[PDB]
Amino acid sequence: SYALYKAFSTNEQDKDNWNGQLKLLLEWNQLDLASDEIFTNDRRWESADLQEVMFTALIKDRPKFVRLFLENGLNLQKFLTNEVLTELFSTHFSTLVYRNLQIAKNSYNDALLTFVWKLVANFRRRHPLQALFIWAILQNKKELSKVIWEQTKGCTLAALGASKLLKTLAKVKNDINAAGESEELANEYETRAVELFTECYSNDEDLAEQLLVYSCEAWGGSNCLELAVEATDQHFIAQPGVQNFLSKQWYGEISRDTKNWKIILCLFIIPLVGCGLVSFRKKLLWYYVAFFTSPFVVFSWNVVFYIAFLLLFAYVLLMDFHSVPHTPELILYALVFVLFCDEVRQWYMNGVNYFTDLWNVMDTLGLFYFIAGIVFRLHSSNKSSLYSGRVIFCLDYIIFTLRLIHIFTVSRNLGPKIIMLQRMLIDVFFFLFLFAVWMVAFGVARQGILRQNEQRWRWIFRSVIYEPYLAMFGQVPS
Amino acid sequence: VFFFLFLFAVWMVAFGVARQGILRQNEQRWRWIFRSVIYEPYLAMFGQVPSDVDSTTYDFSHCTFSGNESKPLCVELDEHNLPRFPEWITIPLVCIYMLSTNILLVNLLVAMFGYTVGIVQENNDQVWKFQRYFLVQEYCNRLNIPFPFVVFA
Amino acid sequence: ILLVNLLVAMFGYTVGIVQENNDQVWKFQRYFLVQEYCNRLNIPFPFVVFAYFYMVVKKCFKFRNEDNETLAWEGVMKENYLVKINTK
């Protein structure tokens, strides 16, 4: 390249063609020579006909040249048209990445990937730099992407969205080299977003909390705090800035640097809201209502209401259950009607993904068992139906009591252990698999050696499955 | 210890109220509510396997038919003087409770104790010889004879 | 004896793994409950249905300069962090 430039520069009719010099040092990778001999004397430039070379620097992987060019001046939206996007996506976008994109859309659909499938269907046939950053990041260019990312305004939203897209394309199980490379680039950009937000929180907290809540004029139609949730970028939320934001939004008006037993003590007796033991920083009737509208105290009131509900259901079910519904059963029915309308309200708010989580499923299932218990309860003077109704209420009280584990996940002490509890399922299933195999192999052998031709189905399972099951608690079959 | 007792109390109440509601009918004595809701599922953590759920080994000599004397009530009877409760809904209930408390919930406590011992041992000797200072000082802050004559001192 | 004391060992090993991920996954799950309690403007729970009636009341009757200001704020620490990257 240096020999070809020294022959091209010394023709003396080519010194006037510095554009040919720039294209020559563009096709080769001469950065130091181009910087030292094209832009040094600063006698000649226009900042407007540097475009085609710019486009050339986009298409044959010249990140250092486009960094050198943008150091000397260009606006990217002035450079960008829709025709550039149609060239880049219709032609310069590879068919292999399109094939893995369709496989990822068919196997792992998200809202952001649906949006990027919409926009790639648009551009194969207002946010300029984000669009070119998208093209750079799905093409795995990995060094042009940093150069354009340093020019963007909404930086953290771009980094989080790119991490989401690259993890979703990294879940694809053919061409595992591309999957691993996009996975590593995802890790790099989520690290970059975390390390930028820790700086802009470590300087100023309030403008950082303003950064967390701005939708950036429909980037992907979402928020900077929402993209970390949709990507399962749980290292972005485990940092002290977002947790400090969540705690300050969780307490509400009450300051964080007070002890919580004072707070529940002022919950226990109402007119202690007006006293000097609790700080309400972040008049008196406003103190009253801004106390009673905090999230912490409405939760800690709702749990007391729930425990009182369980005590009332137990007193109804065990001690006061006659042929006709008395007063406490009707109070109970009113409380379940309140619970039911709240659950159907949050189901109308959340949508179909409400059915995704198992706790919501078993809450709806328990309310279904309760209304089945009512319609078996009210047909009086049939003793079988009146007993079956109470059996249904007992098997529903089991569900309503096991909801309390999910309720108390919020505490600082029991919380991480209850979250840890769901990581044991494969060990429990391995134990139950081996125990069921040894159980059957012993039970059928003992029942075949001892007895002869049991013709009752119940005393097969009482003596094949049930007694070797009891022999796990030290019963020693007799 | 508190996490173990929290989960065991939740499973205890959820099993005890369900079993007492399926078997019997309108216990009006407060003591035999807590003896059969809290106490027997508590004993079922030491391998006791609650007994009145079988409907074959259930004799009526330990009943009362009405709350008059000591013993618990019967399960509520049929028109043929038979037990009404289903075996197919009380036997697997006892099996699920007995598994979930006597095996899973205890062997989880063993794992959490093992992990806490694995953490705190390098801090253990430091905290011990820090606490050593207080006892050394409070025994050196007294100029007295050995203890049964200290009152004279 | 063997099959229970093997389950104890596997529980101990899984607790030995997942504890450094435990606090991260917990405070990630904290977000959903904080939001779903902050996504409601209501009274404490046994009167919520009346507040629900208030929402029924609704169903019964019926470029930005500070944005660019805070993005221009963000760009400053972006420049400072790029300096902190290549200073390494």
Add this chain to the structure above:
Amino acid sequence: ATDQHFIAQPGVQNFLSKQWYGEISRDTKNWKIILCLFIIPLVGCGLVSFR
């Protein structure tokens, strides 16, 4: 040789999985596969890739 580090690498495991599944693609869920085993004339449907 019992050179089990040579077989624990992703290339030989990818080869073994692609020989184990056979015609069925790897990037599908297995419950669809056992569901098409459970009812035979669901072999001719667009839920399983036979590449």
Add this chain to the structure above:
Amino acid sequence: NFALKPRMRKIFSRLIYIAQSKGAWILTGGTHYGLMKYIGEVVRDNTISRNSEENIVAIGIAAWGMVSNRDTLIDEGHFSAYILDNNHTHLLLVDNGCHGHPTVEAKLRNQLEKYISERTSQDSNYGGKIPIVCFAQGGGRETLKAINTSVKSKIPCVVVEGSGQIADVIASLVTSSMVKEKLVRFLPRTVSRLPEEEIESWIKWLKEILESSHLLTVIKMEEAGDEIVSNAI
């Protein structure tokens, strides 16, 4: 046209940080080109970073003959497209005759510099007298004219680098033979258009530069990290 390699970027960002730390004015041309553009952008960056606490003052001094749109009022106007820079908090434009006359701004600028030099404000550590530092990094005639009009006045505290066009010759020369020796090797392409009848004048200009070498200093090559700007000023 103006090239700005990242050394000058780091130096001038550190400079505007120092000037915010000390509470200093920065006098410049103030057009929408190159260095004045970048100084104004870093002024806006420090203006948006802290928003308060001793904000900085950047006086631009322009010619009124080069300005695209000129609107005479008493009533504010909107300047849209030499182009003026956005982010200078104070501008001043010299008045003269016809349009195409550069170097008119230099007389009032250097006279203002002389008056602040002879002004005495005791609440300082210099002994009053309001210390003044001149910088030079680029090339052209007006740079040498500014440095010599500065050094003709006592105490300009001229600082140059070894980076630029005239900064190279002033850094690397430290009589007429050596002047031409460095001038033909560091800038040939401008001197390809220049008659000798003012090149002998430039030899006189640089002679009056090197008359007082204690009032001049240079940022050298291997001071490339931090605190190089404070150690110069």
